[PDB]
Amino acid sequence: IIMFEDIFVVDKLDPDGKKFDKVTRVEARSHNLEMFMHLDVNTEVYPLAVGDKFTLAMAPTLNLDGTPDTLADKYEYIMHGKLYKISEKAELYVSFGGLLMLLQGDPAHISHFELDQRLFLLMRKL
Amino acid sequence: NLLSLGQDSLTAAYLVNVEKNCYLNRAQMQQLQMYCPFQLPPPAIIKASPSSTEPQWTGMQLFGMLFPPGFDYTYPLNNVVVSNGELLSFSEGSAW
Amino acid sequence: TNRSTVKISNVPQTIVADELLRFLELHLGEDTVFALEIPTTRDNWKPRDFARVQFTTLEVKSRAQLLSSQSKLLFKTHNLRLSEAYDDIIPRPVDPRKRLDDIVLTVGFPESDEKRFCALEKWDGVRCWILTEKRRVEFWVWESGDCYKIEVRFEDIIETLSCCVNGDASEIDAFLLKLKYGPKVFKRVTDRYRFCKEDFDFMWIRTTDFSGSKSIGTSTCFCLEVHNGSTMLDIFSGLPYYREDTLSLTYVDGKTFASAAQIVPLLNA
Amino acid sequence: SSDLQSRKNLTEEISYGLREAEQVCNKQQLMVESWRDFLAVNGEDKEEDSVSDLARFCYERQKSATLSELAVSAFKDAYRDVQALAYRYGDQSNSF
Amino acid sequence: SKLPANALSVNSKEGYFVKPSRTNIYNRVLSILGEGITVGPKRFEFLAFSASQLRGNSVWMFASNEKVKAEDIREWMGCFRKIRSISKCAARMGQLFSASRQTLIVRAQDVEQIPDIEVTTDGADYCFSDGIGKISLAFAKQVAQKCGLSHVPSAFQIRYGGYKGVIAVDRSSFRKLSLRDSMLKFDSNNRMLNVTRWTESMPCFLNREIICLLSTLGIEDAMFEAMQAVHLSMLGNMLEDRDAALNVLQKLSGENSKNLLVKMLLQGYAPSSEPYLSMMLRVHHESQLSELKSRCRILVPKGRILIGCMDEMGILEYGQVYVRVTLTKAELKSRDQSYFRKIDEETSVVIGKVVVTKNPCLHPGDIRVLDAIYEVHFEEKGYLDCIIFPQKGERPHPNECSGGDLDGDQFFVSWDEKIIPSEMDPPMDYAGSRPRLMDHDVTLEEIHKFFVDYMISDTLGVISTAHLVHADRDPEKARSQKCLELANLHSRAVDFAKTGAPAEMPYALKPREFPDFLERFEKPTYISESVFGKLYRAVKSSLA
């Protein structure tokens, strides 16, 4: 059910602020896959410091074996969005209700993603 | 166009689309849905915290219930992309 | 690890140098910051987004790097990021032992075939800094108020000798520096974002010989009269072509050889 | 301002910016045919006279109209940077 | 070493505008030049400085004596009060200091005043005759006897009595000597004849700028790679093979040169024996590889470096020239070629496409493809070791070659056929800056000021490096406005020695980065992926 799953380590923060009361864009590089990721995360409700390691997973549906549109107990930062731009080392542009995500990796790593489809975002900081 | 949003609706739309850090819960979103003519979008925010239930709605989806499903809008200057009646991206400028 | 200056990535635009200095002294040790400079786009009212800070000891620099790597530095809801710098704010050696203050400097040449040395002009209370990274030695000489900088590189010297002035062969109270080329001569000329811990708000320009008798231009050797140092030999061993032998000298009154003309090193007709 | 120290820093910055703008206006006032000998790349001993005469520049500006136009244009060009400080010293929650 | 720009006239912002402040070294140099240097019972005075010494911070000093003083020599060289320009006066006073061979003396009774030719098109003054001249056969025979020259060249650089320029031979001469108009630099009290260079038919070389400017017309990287590969292959085989040693010595330095090593190369023992010659060959190979590592120098046997002149015929049109050179070992081994005409046993004519290039070149428009033609009338005059330029045309050939003159300067010629002549670009303008004329005579002080100020703002050596770096970094080199600005600044800097106009190198155009093929180890090094980077990688692989 999970299409892409890898451990990511953050590199730097765009605002670099602890109490800016603003959405923070993070830059995390994939391990053993060499993939760069942009993601807008809320630090106040989900703290993320530099050097932390977190897993990431993407699935079309949260149900087991079908029923598109019970993985909630495993992860803690579930999101929902759609992929609108696929043109690039291919990269993906997924917006979770205005929160842009840029997953830039290799053409072979990302090949089973269609255009204008709904996908989730499973995250856990170990 | 002859008619604009006004002096208050403009500021309210700016505050809705700029903050991006205040999430509206189910009750407030359903209360605000009474005025909007279109239906309710998916929450897009299932879990914002490990111990946070009651999945919430983002602020930019609230402004997305003001466009027809067939209406598509693109504004390269402010990086505003509206596809299938949903606001996808917005950075700053408030020029559109 | 070659230098001691650390470049801070992001700092608030509303802060001053004093606030950052106080924050650093609060988190780190007391008075462990030597120089703090915030670049300004305008003259005095538009600082940039980054700043460069110089630490006194490399241990303090390592501790600051460790704190920044753990994101433990938070100054006005800003996470300070520390990175290496290109050049030092002030060319000052990190080792306090190399810094020699209030020493006697004299010039001369091997006038006699025997173990004799002649003194032309003697300066007291000069400052000597040994820069291993820059491969040069600086001499600060104060003369008639304005100070002058004498720069000697490692290629300028050809052989390092140690001598004594008290007259004891066991003790080492002097050092000979045979010069192949001439030393560079500089001159000192005449605030809100620059602390610098001292009066370093000036510039260095190259000048000619400042001596009235022009002893520097006619001297091919330099002598450093310093107190006996147990570990001074280890510091002086870093100079290229060092001889591990003990030599003694005597002072010869050579004040007669003084030319007031522009062409100094020529003989009198 | 967040506190009193920020207010003092902003006041000092505004004062220095106004002084710099006045200096820029005084420099721009010299772009006339009367100072062609001084603006040339040569040796002039009257460099200190153009700087020490600070109270005469305002009197000369208030008498001429073209000089006044040049001065106001230079002042606006140098004061745009001063106005740009509000985004640095202003928080995101500021209503203005 | 050279005095840095920060040691003299450091800048400081005082007042509304920035004004340079002279350091104590500036005053020291001025005092040394004025008072002079005293060594024992002598006192040296400033006489003059040559063009080469101005670029090397050198100056001549002569000790005044009771017989002849410095002023006596200065007035004996000539009267320089007619020149009202500071730089021009110094250049004319120092031009008469080159090495030369003494010849016979000719009085001032037999000299001609042949009128010149000028054409003004598009509102631009284009002069064909800048330093050209005319010589007879008897004069050549008389001047070639004291120098031990067997063959009579058709052109040789000469300067005498303040005049300077190259002269060409002709078979319709009236008397021994003739003179033109645009050759008098200054009036002199003597007319001693002397010759510096007659003819040098050395093989051509490909410098860095040639490849840099020829890498945009359509020339690929495989050609230069293969040429470098064959060059290194023939260099490595020169050690154990004596056949290649003579062929290299006869095609690298000197077409016809007699030497002890050259004679023994054709007939000698094994390379293992004769250590005196084997070690010389080894050190020559080491010098060649070091020179290749320092700079690009491609040995091309189908091209020479020779000066050019003009003939009073007027038959050649704009785009028609004549190419003739001697025959080397490669040309003599196989003279059957389409673009090579065997007019004589020693001299062979060329009918191929030949381009003209100098050493300093920073503009894409310098490449002017010229078609060489063969005419019996031109061959009847007997021109050798000199390319022929047409008299009539829109613009003279030296003007398109970075705005040069016919002052005996060398020209790169090559009868190559694999080049791409399709693309043609107009040359840059050759109009210099306005001359600066003074209202009073020179009091020997402003010349010292100019000499000292020449060290300050002397950016002649950094412009070429910046241009090379910018060409290697940004693709489509020599097409953007940055390259044009660099070329204009280079022209203005090379005009500094003639007219007192500083180059004014901007700060934003500094490279701040250097490729691998440079000796700046302290400066940051970046891996270049241009043709020069490929050539340097090939050289590194061959040496390792």
3-state secondary structure chain C: CCCCEEEECCCCCCCCHHHHHHHHHHHCCCCCEEEEECCECCCCCCECCCEEEEECCHHHHHHHHHHHHCCCCECCCCECCEEECCCCCCCCCCCCCCCEEEEEEEEECCCCCCCCEEECCEEEEEEEEEECCCCEEEEEEECCCCEEEEEEECCCEEEEEEECCCCCCCCCCEEEEEECCCCEEEEEECCCCECCCCCCCCEEEECCCCCCCCCCCCCCEEEEECCCCCCHHHHHCCCCCEEEEECCCCEEECCCCCCCCCCCCCCCC
Tokens 């050798």 sit at which residue?
E384
| Gap between the terminal Cα atoms of chain A | 20
What is the DSSP annotation of E233-245? HHHHTTTT-HHHH
Q: Is C135 left (phi over 0), alpha (psi -120 to 50) or beta?
A: left
Please give the DSSP secondary-structure letter assigned to residue E68.
Answer: -
Breaks in chain C (C to N over 2.5 Å), named by the residue before each, are 190
Which residues of E109-237 form beta strands (DSSP E)?
A: 118-121, 124-127, 132-135, 155-160, 163-169, 192-195, 202-206
Nearest CA in chain C to A11: C69
**Cross-chain Cβ contact E10/C205 below 8 Å:** yes
Q: Which residues have CB under 8 Å from E213's CB, separation 6+?
A: E361, E362, E363, E364, E366, E367, E478
Residue E348 contacts residue E335 (beta carbons within 8 Å): yes
Breaks in chain D (C to N over 2.5 Å), named by the residue before each, are none
For helices D65-83 and D55-63, what crossing angle results, to 10°?
120
Pick from A12, A18, A44 the residue to mutate for testing the C interface (most C CBs within 10 Å).
Answer: A18
Residue type for position B26: R
| Gap between the terminal Cα atoms of chain B | 13
Residue type for position E230: V
Reported residue count of chain A is: 126
d(C-alpha B57, C-alpha A97), whole Å:
8
Residue E130 contacts residue E407 (beta carbons within 8 Å): yes
Residue C240 contacts residue C157 (beta carbons within 8 Å): yes
- E strand or H helix at D25: helix D4-28
| Nearest-CA distance E16 → chain C (Å) | 14
C65 touches chain E (CB under 8 A): no
Asked whether residue E472 is marked as a ligand-binding residue, the answer is: no
- Establish whether chain C is in contact with chain E, requiring a minimum of 3 CB pairs below 8 angstroms: yes
Counting Cβ atoms within 10 Å, is residue C177 exposed (0-12), middle (13-18) or buried (19+)?
buried
**What six digits make up the tokens of E466?**
């910046």
Which residues of E41-123 form beta strands (DSSP E)?
A: 43-48, 60-63, 101-105, 118-121
d(C-alpha C50, C-alpha C81), whole Å:
10
C-alpha closest to that of E362 among E475, E482, E483: E483
Q: Is E310 left (phi over 0), alpha (psi -120 to 50) or beta?
A: beta
Please give the DSSP secondary-structure letter assigned to residue E39.
Answer: -
Q: Which long-range contacts (CB under 8 A, 24 or more apart) does E236-240 make?
A: E236/E542, E238/E281, E238/E285, E239/E271, E239/E281, E239/E282, E239/E285, E240/E271
For chain D positions 11-50, those within 8 Å of chain E (CB to CB) are 27, 30, 39, 47-48, 50
Q: Which residues have CB under 8 Å from E483's CB, separation 6+?
A: E362, E363, E364, E467, E470, E471, E477
> Which runs of consecutive H residues, i.e. helices, occur in E3-79?
24-35, 51-54, 70-77
C-alpha closest to that of E17 among C46, D38, C190: D38
- Residue range of the domain that includes A114: 4-126
**Phi, psi for residue E263 in degrees, rounded to 5:** -65, -40
C-alpha closest to that of A95 among A104, A105, A85: A85
**What six digits make up the tokens of C61?**
């620099």
Tokens 């912002």 sit at which residue?
E13
| Nearest-CA distance C13 → chain D (Å) | 7
Question: To 5 degrees, how large is the angle CA C50–CA C53–CA C57?
Answer: 155
C-alpha closest to that of E63 among E93, E40, E96: E40
For E197, how many CA atoms within 13 A lie in the half-sphere containing its CB?
14
Which positions in chain A have a beta carbon within 8 angstroms of at least one beta carbon in chain C?
Answer: 12-13, 16-20, 49-51
For B2, how many CA atoms within 13 A lie in the half-sphere containing its CB?
0
Residue E419 contacts residue E357 (beta carbons within 8 Å): no
Q: What is the resolution of this structure in A?
A: 3.4
For C60, how many CA atoms within 13 A lie in the half-sphere containing its CB?
21
What is the DSSP annotation of E326-339? E--HHHHH----SS
**Cross-chain Cβ contact E38/C206 below 8 Å:** no
Counting Cβ atoms within 10 Å, is residue E224 exposed (0-12), middle (13-18) or buried (19+)?
buried
Instruction: Give the number of domains in chain A.
Output: 1
d(C-alpha C202, C-alpha E320), whole Å:
66
d(C-alpha B55, C-alpha B58), whole Å:
10
The experimental method, as deposited, was cryo-EM
For chain E positions 35-64, those within 8 Å of chain C (CB to CB) are 35, 37-41
C-alpha closest to that of C232 among C126, C140, C100: C100
Nearest CA in chain C to D81: C46
User: C100-108 and C33-37: which strand pairing?
Assistant: unpaired
Q: What are the Cα distances from residue E401, in Å, to E156, E200, E351, E355, E361?
A: 20, 20, 21, 10, 9
> For the CA atoms of C203, C206, C209, C215, what is the dihedral angle to 10 degrees?
90
Assign E303 to helix, strand or coil: strand
